[PDB]
Design an enzyme around this catalytic site. Structure first.
Site, short mmCIF file in Angstrom:
data_model
loop_
_atom_site.label_atom_id
_atom_site.label_comp_id
_atom_site.label_asym_id
_atom_site.label_seq_id
_atom_site.Cartn_x
_atom_site.Cartn_y
_atom_site.Cartn_z
N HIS A 133 16.49 29.08 61.68
CA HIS A 133 17.09 28.23 60.65
C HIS A 133 18.49 28.63 60.25
CE1 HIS A 133 13.28 26.26 59.96
NE2 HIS A 133 12.71 27.37 59.53
N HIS A 188 8.26 24.56 62.13
CA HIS A 188 9.36 24.03 61.37
C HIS A 188 10.54 23.72 62.29
CE1 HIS A 188 7.03 26.74 58.62
NE2 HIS A 188 6.95 25.56 58.03
N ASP A 214 3.21 29.45 63.25
CA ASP A 214 2.85 28.80 62.00
C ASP A 214 2.28 27.39 62.17
OD1 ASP A 214 5.57 28.37 62.71
OD2 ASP A 214 6.32 28.85 60.69
N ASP A 268 7.85 27.01 66.88
CA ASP A 268 7.67 27.27 65.46
C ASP A 268 7.43 25.90 64.84
OD1 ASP A 268 8.83 27.47 62.55
OD2 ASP A 268 8.58 29.55 63.18
O1 LIG Z 1 11.10 27.78 50.96
C1 LIG Z 1 10.18 27.00 51.13
C2 LIG Z 1 9.75 26.73 52.57
C3 LIG Z 1 10.45 27.69 53.54
C4 LIG Z 1 9.80 27.64 54.93
C5 LIG Z 1 10.60 28.50 55.91
C6 LIG Z 1 9.92 28.61 57.28
C7 LIG Z 1 10.58 29.74 58.07
C8 LIG Z 1 10.19 29.86 59.56
O2 LIG Z 1 8.80 29.99 59.70
O3 LIG Z 1 10.27 28.66 60.31
C9 LIG Z 1 10.93 31.05 60.20
F1 LIG Z 1 12.24 30.89 60.13
F2 LIG Z 1 10.64 32.16 59.57
F3 LIG Z 1 10.59 31.17 61.47
N1 LIG Z 1 9.50 26.36 50.13
C10 LIG Z 1 9.85 26.42 48.78
C11 LIG Z 1 10.45 27.51 48.13
C12 LIG Z 1 10.89 27.42 46.80
C13 LIG Z 1 10.75 26.22 46.08
C14 LIG Z 1 10.17 25.12 46.72
C15 LIG Z 1 9.74 25.23 48.06
K LIG Z 2 10.24 23.90 66.02
ZN LIG Z 3 8.28 28.36 60.82
#
Ligand SMILES: O=C(CCCCCCC(O)(O)C(F)(F)F)Nc1ccccc1
Ligand SMILES: [K+]
Ligand SMILES: [Zn+2]
Ligand SMILES: O=C(CCCCCCC(O)(O)C(F)(F)F)Nc1ccccc1
Ligand SMILES: O=C(CCCCCCC(O)(O)C(F)(F)F)Nc1ccccc1
Ligand SMILES: O=C(CCCCCCC(O)(O)C(F)(F)F)Nc1ccccc1
Ligand SMILES: [K+]
Ligand SMILES: [K+]
Ligand SMILES: [K+]
Ligand SMILES: [K+]
Ligand SMILES: [K+]
Ligand SMILES: [K+]
Ligand SMILES: [K+]
Ligand SMILES: [Zn+2]
Ligand SMILES: [Zn+2]
Ligand SMILES: [Zn+2]
Lengths: 376, 370, 376, 370
Positions: free
Chosen positions: D143, D182, D268, D180
């Site tokens: 990301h 995401h 994930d 992944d």
């Molecule tokens: O932050 C998030 C979701 C973040 C998800 C990141 C995934 C990272 C990843 O697995 O792809 C990898 F990069 F690690 F691989 N939600 C919130 C936080 C605060 C307030 C509302 C929602």
């Molecule tokens: K992906």
């Molecule tokens: Zn992820």
């Protein structure tokens, strides 16, 4: 420089009992912990391994595993019905194998591996594969009796390793120095009437087993004079242990002339341990290891094995174990102990140190130990 | 039976520092814990509250909260710039407010609430709303100096509460007995030249602050003789504390004639605490509480407030705190301490007990309390 | 405003199984966790209670405990030998009471208390002591069969509470709406041939029990048409649940005319739950509670009881439970859900929503449910 | 059998953010966890390493570490001021480096090591030191933008590794398959106008970044057609991913003829992950790995590198990662996945599978891959 074998298996870190708060079984008035379970947790031993890795020490050791202890090896100490009962309980999801000896699912196999590491560590040193060895044997051993698990110990690891070494190599004189802060009652009982094993325990007076001091318990008949208990006053630290080493331990080793030295090395005498009241720092463990290595070089051709027993501070045990391994291997890492100076300031005052010193002088005289100097 | 107010707020259990392994900040050679975190965790205090609830004791107490400490109350001890610095660091996600004084996000507001509970507990007892009180004040207070956070303490809770009580009620003689295992250096410093507050600390000799004994530091000028330090030998337990209470504490309280007694009650002298080397069990804390309650009944019309300070054994602090609250309230629950008999077997032997007793006799003579 | 009883006992938070990694028993290839044990941990339920306290909600509720369920109450559902076996295992330190039903030391007594809270909550509402009630019943109940513990449930809490309520108050028509994300198989089985209890389960199709959908299982003989399963597609969120409520649940309640509504309220349909794949936010739970409260006000004189079942996100379950209690009590706290807007953006797209809507329309027709509007 | 290099350093497991409940920063209404902490915890990655050790698989791999990424390597993607800001915040005890990008004390050095492992893994495979490689790169990368940390990523690990590989070895065509769950927005952005890197992301439609689908974002100008997003419906599992692989991924790789394949392998999409809603089991990851290995053998002389990204189930990620490494190495351990049969019963029904299949057919036609 020295060749140090490090006997380790990741599976030993997978042994885990049912829910406990420190040493208290969960139930009745003892609430389940939100995180940290039984005091004998994988995390102390795991954090030692992690620090050895990041420090670069592990790369300088001979990293070894071993097969699990055979029934034959175990049966030299423990009865078949003990093995059966232990295995049955382990297969049924764990539970209580003794007083203060809780087990988990599959703990039987993991306990066999722990015993196997100790067996193999003695074997390697007697075979000349390494100058000395450290065995990260979890679960621990030094309280276990032939037919009774106790104090988080399910097999008598050191005793099993010694009886195996006698059968394979024919070693005649082994000294076991137990600096785990609790009394090495298992080793004491097994060898109590034997003169081929000198068992010495430094321990906090009355800590575990509770109320046991033991200075007058010097062995019997053939073993009379081949067991020594040094019940140190609660609250003692570096000086108490140094005086014990110089006035009792080293003179006792000199008279015995060990062909192999085994250390039952718990780190629970450290200054922040919940399970005892002593004040050691990492350099105390370093100095004890230096003294016993020197004794091994003088009598036993350098043959020294250190077997991990207790130690319940997740934060501090890694620094203490690291100091021991540095001293065994002769390799000094860049790690600096962040609690060392602080613990130095907490030590007993001069009056208290003098009080303990006088008791140790008296005890040395009671044991009939001559204050000779190291030679040979 | 006695009316005991229990000052508690759930939000005090929400204070949390950044990652620590026991007292060591994570970083350099200190690996982050897989679970644990900082020794001053919510869990010890939470498990005390939980045991009070499951035992049924909470139903026999007068449950109270309180407003957070006002700036006015805080400013009697701490400067405005200290408040500002603390708040700024708290708003920025936390960090290091002092030596051994780490804070987390929002810790500022939670520290104000902790201080507020102590203020309100003294007020309730002086107002006659309860015979005595227990304040579950987290974060703790007794190391905090006016302009320096230390030892996990960010406001001088007891001192703030005392200065507020003097302003509101005009109490003339307050005794502060500090049986937290570490030296009550904050209370000592603030009241060092004052004779209206008798500060007594029982502590492990040299534990924290490290290397400090302090027997000769008895106060100065107007306060000379109104500070007493009892540096107990590491490894001591029940008898050492009972001898300290009988030979030093009780005689000192008798001479002073307190109109209010405050206890800075840490439980870190318990036999399984990681942050000290003493050997108390729950009945030791029960007995200390009984002794100080009796002194309060004799001089202070029963007016006694116990303020929670340290205690780092998740497993055992709940039993110790419960024993204190049972003794304050005069109510005995069905709870049985599972470590009590075991800890009795671990106590110092007769020679060691005699050695410590003789030192306490000598110290009592030094203090002129024969 | 409404009077909401909150049935809670701290001891329910003390139930704890042996070591598990999520739902996997520790052993074999499953390493013991360093911290977080079995998914059904005290922490979700504890964090709900903590948030209720700090939000000021608890102060606006009628906080109640209750005696544990008597043998008499339990025996209406469970056999004496089940109770004996459960107690024996609980006294022996815990272990496995069923498939996916692990227990700890003293779990028997705690399970009796959990059942007791549910019994008392129904009793209070039927007695007119409160308009409605929430029971923080841990361990949960809705999978438990008369002679088989399953899915972390050891007594059939809701069924025990209903049979007790029938014996004490003589209530004739009870509806049980189960919005825990897993199938309410216990409630379904017990009442399967009964028309005095309408059991409705909204669940993720095939989640737990694994592979079970159940749309065609509508009850039998006397109970035919008094059981409805709504197997929602994995991945669905707010719209899927709203459509299910409007097209199936509310029409089913209207035809049944419940004198009491019980909700088996798990929060494991939340968007970050490890144990299911649904996308609800706190306002989804709020809206479901609003709909069922309205139905209770129209048919049952407001008599509604919400019984806590599942929910395995420590971070998010507190916000979801809080929304339900706010809706029951008519009190809106200052708490703002920090994940609400984020979860809104993750919802199924229009094509997926339309696909699920069409399936629900078909299912409503298959059940013979008329799309009437709410009245009375 | 194949030679698989396993790039790992224990220090990567020492990175840790301040207190979080899952992804929520502690503070305001979010109570500190009693144990847990941030979702991107060391424990998932540590438990994979532990299972590799206990299974005996580690003994059949080529174990390697690597130096941390040099400033030179990092500066191919990130500006000097980004490095400076990151280091300053890391030295000051950590905090918030971006939106959903919290760091801890010393995280800067640990992020450099994570990037270093990815660089070294590509280098080893291109140098012929191993047939393929797995890099346990924590913290993750996919990301991260050049000047913006996001989604727990602080350096663009894969992009840094690719730009280093192009400088050292002169590889002309690299494919990056990101499974992944995401969206791989970092990789997408960096290579969006480039035809030397084919970036493919399989992701849950709208998961993270929230609301992003992206099927129509196929690259621009020189890169038009060299970015493919496959936004899978939430709730999909094994069949959805197998259909995506067969209808989109494999045809796309065939057309592109990669000389190296890199997989951004998050776990994930597993069936018990808290941070997504997909239903994969360990054999799904095994099958995906088998498919991409076969594509690597056909076009890239077997040159395949798998870089660990996300995965938040402590219990289940180890089984999924193990399946990938078994497939890379051609070695099957004694480990049996205890959830496999259970997850197979939970899969989408036939109607739902058909619905998703039709959407993938339509998407394949959109991409011109019929
Ligand atoms: O932050 C998030 C979701 C973040 C998800 C990141 C995934 C990272 C990843 O697995 O792809 C990898 F990069 F690690 F691989 N939600 C919130 C936080 C605060 C307030 C509302 C929602
Ligand atoms: K992906
Ligand atoms: Zn992820
Ligand atoms: O009995 C204990 C303490 C057990 C201490 C064992 C020490 C083990 C050891 O470190 O030496 C080693 F073996 F691990 F090395 N607690 C109680 C007592 C009664 C009730 C509950 C808890
Ligand atoms: O900080 C400490 C010891 C701090 C002990 C504070 C006790 C606080 C208290 O219980 O009395 C009360 F105030 F909470 F009550 N050691 C370190 C840390 C870093 C490096 C070396 C040593
Ligand atoms: O069976 C399970 C999942 C159990 C899920 C029970 C849900 C309980 C519940 O939330 O509805 C409530 F009852 F708590 F409410 N896992 C496996 C399967 C096989 C092997 C290991 C693990
Ligand atoms: K010993
Ligand atoms: K002997
Ligand atoms: K003190
Ligand atoms: K004074
Ligand atoms: K349901
Ligand atoms: K029915
Ligand atoms: K591209
Ligand atoms: Zn020990
Ligand atoms: Zn203290
Ligand atoms: Zn559920």
């Amino acid at each position: 420089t020295r060749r140090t074998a490090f006997f380790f298996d990741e599976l030993c870190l997978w042994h885990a009992a049912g829910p406990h708060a420190l040493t208290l079984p969960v139930g009745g008035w003892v609430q389940p912990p939100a995180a940290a379970g039984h005091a004998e947790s994988p995390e102390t031993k795991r954090r030692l391994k992690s620090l050895l890795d990041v420090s670069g020490l592990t790369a300088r050791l001979q990293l070894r595993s071993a097969p699990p202890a055979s029934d034959e090896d175990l049966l030299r100490v423990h009865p078949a019905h003990y093995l059966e009962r232990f295995k049955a309980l382990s297969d049924a999801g764990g539970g209580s194998l003794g007083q203060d000896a809780p087990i988990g699912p599959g703990s039987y196999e993991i306990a066999r591996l722990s015993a196997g590491l100790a067996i193999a560590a003695l074997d390697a040193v007697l075979a000349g594969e390494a100058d000395n060895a450290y065995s990260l044997s979890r679960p621990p051993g030094h309280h276990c009796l032939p037919d009774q698990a106790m104090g988080f110990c399910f097999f008598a690891n050191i005793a099993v390793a010694i009886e195996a070494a006698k059968a394979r190599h024919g070693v005649e004189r082994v000294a076991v120095l137990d600096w785990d802060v609790h009394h090495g009652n298992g080793t004491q009982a097994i060898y109590y009437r034997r003169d081929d094993v000198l068992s010495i325990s430094l321990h906090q007076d009355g800590c575990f087993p509770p109320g046991y001091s033991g200075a007058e318990d010097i062995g019997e008949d053939r073993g009379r004079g081949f067991n020594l208990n040094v019940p140190l006053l609660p609250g003692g630290g570096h000086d108490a242990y140094m005086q014990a080493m110089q006035r009792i331990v080293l003179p006792a080793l000199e008279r015995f002339r060990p062909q192999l030295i085994v250390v039952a090395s718990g780190f629970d005498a450290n200054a922040v341990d919940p399970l005892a009241r002593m004040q050691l720092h990492s350099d105390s463990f370093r100095a004890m290891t230096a003294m016993v290595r020197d004794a091994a070089e003088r009598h036993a051709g350098g043959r020294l094995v250190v077997v991990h027993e207790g130690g319940y501070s997740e934060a501090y045990v890694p620094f203490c174990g690291l100091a021991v391994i540095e001293e065994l291997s002769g390799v000094r890492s860049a790690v600096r102990d962040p609690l060392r100076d602080f613990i130095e300031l907490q030590q007993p005052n001069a009056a208290f140190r003098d009080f303990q010193r006088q008791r140790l002088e008296e005890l040395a005289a009671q044991f009939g130990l001559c204050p000779a100097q190291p030679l040979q």
